[PDB]
From a paper:
Metal-dependent formate dehydrogenases (Fdh) catalyze the reversible conversion of CO2 to formate, with unrivalled efficiency and selectivity. Desulfovibrio vulgaris Hildenborough (Dv) Formate Dehydrogenase 1 (DvFdhAB) is a W-containing enzyme capable of interconverting CO2 and formate under mild conditions, with high specificity and turnover rates (being especially active towards CO2 reduction, when compared with other Fdhs). DvFdhAB contains a W active site coordinated by two Molybdopterin Guanine Dinucleotides (MGD), one selenocysteine (SeCys) and one terminal sulfido ligand (=S/−SH). Additionally, four [4Fe-4S] clusters are used for electron transfer.
In this study, we soaked as-isolated crystals of DvFdhAB with sodium formate and flash cooled them in liquid nitrogen at different time points. Notably, in Fdh_1min, one formate molecule is observed for the first time close to the active site, making hydrogen bonds with Nε from R441 and Oγ from T450. Formate molecules were assigned for the first time to populate the catalytic pocket of a Fdh. This movement seems to be independent of the metal site reduction changes.
Numbering used by the authors:
A (entry chain A): 36 to 861, 869 to 1005
B (entry chain B): 2 to 215
């Protein structure tokens, strides 16, 4: 035995950093009764097999860290010091702030006289870091209290992309999963630095290369990823759509599309209306006054029954595929090479390697993460990726898919639980003020008269009603519908989002903010503005592991605490390894993890903080009345708790759901109190509750499928690494989405040697089939209204086909592809004192704003200080020596950093001028360590895209000077 | 005996290995600063048994050859360092006969530390300026004896770090060298006959570090 581990209890956990979802083994002293003594990899976990990057590998030092918060702290207005306080004090006083703010601000009905039952005077940030049961509980508490301004991380990195995937495939989520990358014949990493940002993914990527795969990195910078790819192709910032449009023209010109797949499974054969046109960078229906499109002008020509007309011969000139060929003929090699800055030989090399996967028995995958997709045409960047993949038949197949890598360990889950302003759990929209009744809310789901089209979203009334039953089980859903807040049908949706919460804050329009598991004073673009703007709050509640730049904004650089009136409650939460619950990884794997050490000092799990806090508000309403009490008083928090504490287990069971009576559904008898076995058995009549329909099938009478640790696989499962008995993925354990597309109309795989599903003897074998039905009886994209993979995407604001519009304002004046320079549906100053393109990105060793990793000695030891990476050319021009101190400045702020002069950064060539890109990490903050530096977000602008409402952190103008 | 095979053609410089070594042993962190590199700590020391060395080499066309070298004691079959130390006090350095591990005991405070480092053809040993103890990678010999992989090997996500019986590892290194040559045709095994840590280099070992090979 090893003395260190000999007397400790061994439990399993899941990494608290990135969305790979690596397994841990935690050893805890006194057979679980004391502190952690060791954290390392779980050798049995099939994603990491024991391996950890330095973030997971250092979780012992994160947890057993004596800089962690120990008890609530209170900061009285204008004080220059924290006073330590009891949980009782903190939470009772926070409950009184909420009540006072709500009673004073609540609006039954807006201007137009519509019912809205909301408060706009309190906003909430966070968090993808909380467990799935905490995320769900959190959303329901904030909405019970009437909040609409409810945002977290997902807004910044995933919101600008998800609608690309939803339009193309019918769902927003990563299409495959990490293990599946090993099955790919060609891996295109584009807007991702996965070797640093998803490091255990490279176990599977280098395994794909062992099996013959070509690895391609397309990045403006040569990275740790780049060092291990076959092909590094530099691209100038914002030239992604030229690159991908050129790949589409290459595929059609050279006839490398998967013809049968394209004919049967995509909307290639659909006939677009005569009103569709495109000329000089504008599609038909353009309103030049409102900078907005009439999308009805893009409608399909519908048959007598209301079904889009198809020409399966693909001859009709208004066939999607024919309009597609015509749209992309402008993206020739010379034009694309000139704008991308990628050599013609290297474009040809990448096009020929990747388009070879159009072969039925070859698979290409695309990995992207955040990259530079933040801007107004990021959604169209991801559309082009989706369309390429559909052309090559790489959707639904092993080694295929669009692997939109999620960032934070549970950003998939936090999004699924609706911690964004526009969604309830399970991607049911938040009602607007015109959705007066449940019947009317339900009236908006489009129907299909195509019998082959499953159009699964028609089942929405079941999910909404089953949802309202888990919150308000004694009310009729129609009645409960009126307790939850509604947004203005009149307002721009982006008015309720991240960037506008900061804009509103800076105008004093908020009394209260919850900074729950986030560090906005470092996370938000233009930190100078947001730090000042946080002054204009009455109260700030911060729930975090450590004191930080947000909790302590009032004593930050250039701040005088005396002048600042904001009252702050700092509530210290427990680490991931000190609590039980589930996190949903990038692959939709919902994984259970267990408590190892008891919470450090007087820290609490988020669930207990939020439950106790709400209970205080409810007891306060039940003593002194106030604005519209019913939503608060009737919420069923009883199903959330067990032995007086937040119960992850009970909340997870409520999320899956259970029958409120004996019921017949899909011709099967179900007893009241039974767990719902799948969302296929939810009802709209109040027979069923489910906190989240996606979670229906996750915790059944069979028990907690998320806590399965079973590596049992049939040979066809093990050949592609599905691991279907390891935890549980939504929907209903379908590991690869769109898998019906992986077989012909008889149920035989395109690639037998890597089958996903196969029809053998009356049954789908391998993965769980994505949509029930015999081979050749259903369109494969069951969440699509029409049931096809959309090459032509007429629900996108920017147009049905991706078109290059220049996202770099400052150094570019001419569009080679059209007369239209910028997105015609979307005021950079470009002050010439700031000639360099600044960009922010990550390193392997630090996490987000560095609030967690700047407290971890081993990670600071490897990356102690903020740096600025620059080319030798820019080094030569500004007289900067390797390691010299530099000043980096913009219109928004300035900071000092260590120059790294490296050949890994090259100047761009834009309209025959050298433009220098300068690279900073955004992992640093003024609180810790000494000499670390401050956030790169001192430099960034808080001007974003009218349509995305997402800030600009990847291309902003700076100067860099030797100091 | 046991052998590491370290395939540097697979390394992402994640520095999982560097952090894992310190987590397993509960080693303190050095005071470091950025002096124009990701590399930190800059060097092995009394409290740093493994550091990932980063080297940028210019190449024709876009990008670089970015060379990563996670440095540790090579657990030499015939340890120079022992030969030097067995002159001041036979006992300070021993060889576990089970594992192959070359181990520095508490008795290294008695010998001339300076002299043992100079004997090491890989410049590996480091001195505690307080206790005059010699410290370095101990092969995680406790874990190995208990049938566990060393911390740096279990943590590695890429398949760079490999550990096992000297027979299986030399077998794997020969078979891996053949496959790797198809991408990095100048790839070589570092001193495969003298050491228990066999590095596969993608080119001139000396490009990875001055003491990459003897
Ligand atoms: N180690 C580590 N891992 C993390 C995180 C962390 O903080 N540290 N954070 C996580 C989170 S929350 C997220 S959302 C993800 C983000 O994951 P990534 O998107 O991989 O993260 P970044 O390093 O910000 O950006 C990726 C790459 O995009 C490149 N890039 C910049 N502009 C362009 C462009 O115009 N085109 C293309 N093709 N590439 C461009 C950058 O040079 C960089 O190499 O990572 C997650 N993982
Ligand atoms: N310039 C620039 N800015 C960026 C980015 C960029 O690329 N460039 N990236 C953007 C992106 S993609 C994102 S996702 C945001 C991230 O911004 P934030 O989420 O605000 O960043 P952090 O707070 O550092 O993220 C981790 C947080 O989780 C908390 N935490 C950990 N475990 C728990 C727990 O159990 N409970 C609670 N309550 N908290 C816990 C930690 O204390 C820490 O505050 O930043 C954005 N900002
Ligand atoms: S940060 Fe991501 S890759 Fe690293 S150990 Fe954690 S989950 Fe795995
Ligand atoms: S073998 Fe053990 S002691 Fe040696 S470098 Fe690896 S983790 Fe550190
Ligand atoms: S590498 Fe140096 S310290 Fe390690 S066994 Fe060899 S001579 Fe001794
Ligand atoms: S853990 Fe493996 S991939 Fe990462 S630096 Fe160490 S040897 Fe290289
Ligand atoms: S994220
Ligand atoms: W993110």
């Amino acid at each position: 035995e090893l003395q260190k581990l000999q007397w400790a209890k061994q439990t399993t956990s899941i990494c608290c950093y990135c969305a790979v979802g690596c397994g841990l083994i935690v050893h805890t002293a006194k057979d679980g009764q004391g502190r952690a003594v060791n954290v390392e990899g779980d050798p049995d976990h099939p994603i990491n097999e024991g391996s950890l990057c330095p973030k997971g590998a250092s979780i012992f030092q994160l947890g057993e860290n004596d800089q962690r918060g120990t008890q609530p702290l209170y900061r009285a207005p204008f004080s220059d010091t924290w006073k330590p306080v009891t949980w009782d004090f903190a939470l009772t006083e926070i409950a009184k702030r909420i009540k006072k703010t709500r009673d004073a601000s609540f609006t039954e009905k807006n201007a137009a006289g519509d019912l809205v039952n909301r408060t706009e005077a309190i906003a909430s940030f966070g968090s993808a870091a909380m467990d799935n049961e905490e995320c769900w509980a959190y959303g329901n508490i904030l909405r019970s209290l009437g909040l609409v301004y409810i945002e977290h991380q997902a807004r910044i990195x995933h919101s600008p992309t998800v609608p690309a995937l939803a339009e193309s495939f019918g769902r927003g989520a990563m299409t495959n999963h990490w293990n599946d990358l090993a099955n790919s014949d060609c891996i295109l990493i584009m807007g991702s630095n996965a070797a640093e940002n998803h490091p255990i993914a490279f176990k599977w990527v280098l395994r794909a290369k062992d099996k013959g795969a070509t690895l391609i990195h397309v990045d403006p910078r040569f990275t740790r990823t780049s060092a291990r790819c076959d092909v590094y192709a530099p691209i100038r910032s914002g030239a992604d759509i030229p690159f991908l449009g050129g790949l589409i023209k290459y595929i059609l010109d050279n006839k490398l599309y998967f013809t049968d797949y394209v004919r049967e499974y995509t909307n290639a054969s659909l006939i677009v209306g005569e009103k569709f046109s495109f000329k000089d960078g504008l599609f038909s229906g353009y309103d030049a006054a409102n900078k907005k499109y009439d999308k009805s002008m893009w409608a399909f020509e519908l048959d007598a029954n209301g079904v889009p007309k198809r020409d399966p011969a693909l001859k009709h000139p208004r066939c999607v595929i024919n309009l597609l060929k015509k749209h992309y003929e402008r993206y020739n090699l010379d034009k694309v090479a000139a704008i991308t800055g990628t050599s013609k030989e290297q474009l040809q090399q990448v096009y020929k390697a990747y388009a070879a996967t159009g072969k039925p028995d070859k698979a290409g995958t695309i990995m992207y993460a955040m990259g530079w997709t933040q801007h107004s045409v990021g959604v169209q960047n991801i559309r082009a990726m989706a369309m390429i993949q559909l052309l090559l038949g790489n959707i639904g197949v092993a080694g295929g898919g669009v692997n939109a890598l999620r960032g934070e360990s549970n950003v998939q889950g936090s999004t699924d639980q609706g911690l964004l302003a526009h969604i309830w759990p399970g991607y049911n929209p938040v009602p607007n003020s015109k959705a007066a009744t449940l019947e009317l809310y339900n009236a908006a789901t489009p129907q299909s008269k195509d019998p082959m089209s499953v159009n699964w979203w028609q089942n929405r009334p079941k999910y909404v009603a089953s949802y309202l039953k888990a919150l308000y089980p004694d009310e009729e859903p129609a009645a409960a519908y009126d307790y939850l807040p509604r947004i203005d049908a009149g307002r721009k949706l982006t008015d309720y989002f991240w960037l506008n919460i900061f804009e509103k804050m800076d105008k004093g329009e908020f009394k209260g903010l919850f900074a729950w598991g986030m560090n906005p004073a470092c996370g938000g673009a233009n930190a100078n503005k947001n730090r000042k703007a946080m002054g204009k709050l009455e109260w700030l509640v911060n729930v975090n592991l450590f004191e930080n730049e947000t909790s302590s904004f009032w004593k930050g650089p250039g701040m005088n605490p005396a002048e600042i009136g904001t009252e702050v409650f700092f509530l210290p939460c427990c680490v991931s390894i000190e609590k039980e619950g589930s996190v949903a990884n990038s692959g939709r794997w919902m994984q259970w993890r267990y408590r190892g050490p008891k919470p450090y000092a007087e820290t609490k799990p988020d669930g207990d903080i939020m439950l106790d806090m709400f209970k205080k508000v409810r007891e306060l309403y039940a003593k002194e009345g106030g604005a519209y009490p019913a939503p608060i008083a009737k919420l069923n928090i009883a199903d959330w708790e067990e032995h007086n504490e937040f119960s992850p287990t009970k909340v997870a069971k409520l999320m899956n759901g259970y029958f409120l009576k004996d019921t017949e559904v899909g011709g099967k008898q179900f007893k009241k109190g039974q767990q719902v076995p799948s969302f296929a058995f939810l009802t709209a009549d109040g027979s069923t509750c489910s906190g989240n329909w996606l979670h229906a099938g996750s915790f059944t009478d069979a028990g907690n499928l998320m806590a399965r640790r079973d590596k049992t696989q049939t040979p066809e499962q093990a050949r592609i690494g599905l691991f279907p008995n390891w935890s549980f993925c939504w929907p209903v354990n379908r590991r690869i989405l769109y898998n019906r597309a992986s077989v012909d109309k008889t149920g035989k795989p395109w690639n037998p040697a890597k089958a996903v599903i196969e029809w053998k003897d009356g049954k789908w074998v391998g993965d769980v089939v994505d949509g029930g039905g015999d081979p050749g009886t259903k369109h494969p994209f069951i969440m699509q209204t029409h049931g096809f993979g959309a090459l032509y995407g007429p629900g996108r604001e920017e147009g049905p086909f991706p078109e290059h519009y220049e996202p770099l304002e400052c150094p570019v004046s001419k569009n080679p592809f059209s007369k239209q320079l910028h997105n015609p549906v979307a005021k950079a100053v470009c002050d010439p004192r700031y000639p360099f393109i600044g960009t922010t990105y990550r390193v392997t060793e630090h996490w987000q704003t560095g609030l967690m990793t700047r407290r971890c000695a081993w990670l600071v030891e490897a990356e102690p200080q903020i740096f600025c990476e620059i080319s030798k050319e820019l080094a030569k021009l500004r007289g900067i020596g390797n390691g010299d101190t530099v000043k980096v400045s913009s219109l928004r702020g300035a900071l000092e950093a260590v120059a790294i002069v490296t050949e890994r950064i090259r100047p761009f060539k834009i309209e025959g001028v050298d433009v220098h890109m300068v690279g900073l990490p955004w992992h640093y903050g003024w609180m810790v360590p000494k000499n670390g530096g401050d956030t790169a977000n001192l430099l960034t602008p808080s001007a974003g895209d009218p349509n995305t409402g997402i800030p600009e952190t990847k291309a902003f103008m700076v100067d860099v000077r030797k100091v | 005996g046991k052998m590491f095979f370290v395939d540097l053609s697979r390394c992402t410089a994640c520095r999982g290995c560097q952090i894992a070594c310190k987590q397993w042993k509960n080693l303190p962190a050095e005071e470091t600063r950025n002096t124009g590199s990701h590399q930190n700590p800059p060097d092995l020391s009394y409290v740093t048994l493994k550091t990932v060395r980063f080297t940028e080499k210019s190449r024709k066309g876009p990008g670089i050859d970015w060379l990563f070298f996670p440095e540790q004691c090579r657990h030499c079959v015939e340890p120079p360092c022992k030969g030097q130390a067995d002159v001041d006090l036979e006992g300070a350095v021993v060889k576990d006969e089970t594992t192959g591990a070359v181990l520095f005991t508490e008795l290294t405070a008695k010998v001339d530390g300076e002299s043992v480092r100079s004997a090491c053809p890989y410049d590996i040993p480091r001195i505690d300026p307080v206790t005059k103890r010699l410290s370095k990678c101990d092969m995680c010999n406790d874990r190995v004896q208990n049938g566990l992989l060393p911390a740096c090997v279990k943590t590695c996500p890429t398949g760079t770090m490999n550990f096992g019986d000297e027979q299986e590892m030399l077998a794997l290194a020969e078979k891996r060298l053949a496959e790797v040559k198809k991408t990095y045709p100048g790839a070589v095994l570092g001193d495969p006959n003298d050491v228990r840590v066999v590095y596969l280099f993608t080119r001139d070992p000396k490009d990875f570090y001055e003491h990459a090979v003897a």
